[PDB]
Every structure is written in C-alpha cells, then in structure tokens.
C-alpha cells in the first residue's frame, strides 16, 4: 500500500527468522514479567553451544524494551551479559533477544549449599564471585548506568565451556520513569525511607547484602512477604543497630524520617551490631572480609564505599587471590537448568 514493493519483498527474503536459525521448542527455561527465555542451539550447527533466547513480553517496542536494546548494544565487558543478536518478527510484532547461555546463578548456588547443610568449597569462590560482581558494576557505573535491582537471581555464573565459572551480571533496571522508584531484602535504607532517585550507592548496598549471603548462606536482611516498609527496617536495625545522628546526618532530610521516629526507638536495638551478627554465623570481625563488608553495608549512602575503592581493598590481595574461574578448575556440583514444559 504505502511502501515500495521491491524494497519490502527484498527485506522479507533476506530477513533472518528465529524459528529457522535456532532450535528451541520445549527448551523453555524461564518465564516471568520480562517474557519467555529458552535454552537454544543453532539449527545450522556452526557454533554448537548453548544460547539464551528471550522473547520480550507484549507487542511492539516498549520504552523498557527500547532502552534495554539501546544500552546492551553499546555495553561490552566480560562480567556483563552480552546481547549477541536481535530478531524482529514483523507479523506478530514480537522482539527476540539472543544472549550467551549461563547454566547457573547465585540464587540456585546459595540455595544448593543451604539445602546441602541440612539434607563455597574452593576457598576463594566467595572472593572471586565478589570481585567479578564489583568489576562488572564498576563498568556500568563508569558509563553512568545503574543496575537498580541487584540480587542473587540477577548474578549469573557460566557453566562448562570457554568462559567456565565467569560471573555475568543480568537484568539491569533499564527503564524507570524519570529515574525514580516513585522482596525488599537487597534495598538500601534510603529507598525504604523514600529516596526520590536511584544512585550508585544503592547498587553497592545490594552487593554488600549478596556478600553477606555468600559468607553465611542466608539472606542477611531476611523478612516476610509503597516506599516505606516497617518490618524490613526492623530487620535492618536488628542486624546493624539503629543509626546515630553522627552516623547519618542527612537522615532528617528523608521524606519518611518522621514516620521512622514515630514507629522506632534507639533503645530497642541497643545490643545490635554487624560485628555481633557475623560472629553468630562464624565470621571473624578481625578478618579483611568483615571490614570490607562493613564499608559496603554502611547506613548513610554518602559514607558507603564505591565499587572502584572496593576493588582496591586489601582483602583482594590476601591469600587466596581471586580467580577468573570462580570454581578454580574444580568439578561443578550444581545441577543444570530444568525445562519448563507447562505453558
């Protein structure tokens, strides 16, 4: 009708279709808000390795989809997931994204150890995991890109292959309206007290929570299931103690400060500290690991350490050193991803 016919049919003939280039039926590994993700392999077998194939939820190009494609297309770093290809399906108006396949993640890895303890064996796996996470976020932050939702589910680790045991950060908050938030286990206290903007500091707090969880095998600020949340703050004070005026001077400039004063009392958390908590989970406060963790889990955002400064911490110069393969050449005990047949 509107468009040139020769141009139209030439592109239709040349256009690569996902169904023709990749085998993925009954290989669905995940379904969520993001859409449907599959463990895919090439039909014309050149590479002969696994790929993560993601059909985005909904039709067309949303703002969330548009920014995800925009940023991933520029970002390149070993510790950040790489967008390999983008297939646009013209008839149904669906958008497909192709990634490198990651067999594991911190959510499953930590759950396996917590499961194993009832029913971290390379000594520097936690340190290696931590260093690669920091390296990846440093890359994003250096390019003024925030993650905005760091948690063990989003920290992927590569299975057997060339990139064996490399951390890959996934699922950045690509589109939040006006850069604003306007489980809670990894969310920094300023967000819980109604901060209007995401910051680099917010991502760092989440890394501290993941590092604590890696050391103990339990979420440090574990809790029951808009900005304000009393029981989550109750848990943070149960671990950390209540922040003194000297510790966080700007706390009075938070919108939910009066609600905090109404609902809480310093005296309640008198015998509470990160030292005492980590002592209960067999981690020494003399250790370099603890002193780094304390710098990451600081109540006041402006007193929180940067990812650059975290990578320069003498913890990473202490034996054992961080390795590129977090498994350190060991056999991987964690199972492969199960397929989701039910649609």
């Amino acid at each position: 009708d509107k468009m040139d016919y020769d141009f139209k049919v030439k592109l239709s003939s040349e256009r690569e279709r996902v169904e023709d280039l990749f085998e993925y039926e009954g290989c669905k590994v995940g379904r969520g808000t993001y859409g449907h993700v599959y463990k895919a392999k090439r039909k014309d077998g050149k590479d002969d390795k696994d790929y993560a194939l993601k059909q985005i939820e909904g039709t067309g190009i949303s703002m969330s989809a548009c920014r995800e494609i925009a940023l991933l297309r520029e970002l390149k770093h070993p510790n950040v997931i790489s967008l390999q290809k983008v297939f646009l399906s013209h008839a149904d108006r669906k958008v497909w994204l192709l990634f490198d396949y990651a067999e594991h993640d911190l959510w499953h890895i930590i759950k396996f150890h917590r499961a194993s303890k009832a029913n971290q064996l390379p000594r520097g796996m936690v340190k290696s995991l931590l260093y690669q996470i920091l390296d990846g976020i440093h890359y994003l932050h250096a390019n003024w890109v925030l993650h905005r939702d760091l948690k063990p589910a989003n920290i992927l680790v590569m299975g057997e292959g060339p990139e064996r045991g490399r951390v890959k950060i996934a699922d950045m908050g690509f589109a939040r309206l006006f850069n604003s938030p306007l489980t809670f286990w990894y969310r920094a206290p300023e967000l819980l007290l109604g901060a209007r903007h995401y910051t680099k500091a917010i991502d760092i707090w989440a890394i501290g929570c993941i590092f604590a969880e890696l050391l103990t095998s339990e979420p440090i600020f574990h809790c029951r299931q808009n900005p304000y949340h009393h029981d989550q703050l109750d848990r943070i004070f149960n671990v950390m103690g209540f922040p003194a005026d000297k510790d966080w001077e700007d706390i009075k400039k938070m919108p939910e400060h009066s609600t905090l004063m109404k609902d809480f009392r310093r005296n309640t958390y008198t015998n509470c500290s990160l030292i005492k908590y980590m002592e209960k989970h067999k981690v020494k406060p003399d250790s370099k690991a603890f002193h780094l963790l304390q710098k990451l889990l600081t109540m006041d955002p402006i007193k929180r350490i940067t990812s650059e400064q975290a990578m320069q911490d003498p913890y990473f110069l202490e034996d054992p050193l961080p390795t590129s393969d977090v498994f350190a050449g060991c056999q991987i005990p964690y199972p492969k991803r199960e397929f989701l047949t039910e649609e």
Partner: peptide, 14 residues
C-alpha cells in the same frame, strides 16, 4: 515503520 527503522540501523540507538 518503526520496525524497519530499528532493523536498518542494526539497533544503534545511542
């Protein structure tokens, strides 16, 4: 039209 534009630009949006 949006789909044709995004394809020719090879998703180079920045």
């Amino acid at each position: 039209c949006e789909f044709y534009l995004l394809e020719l630009m090879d998703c180079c949006l920045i």
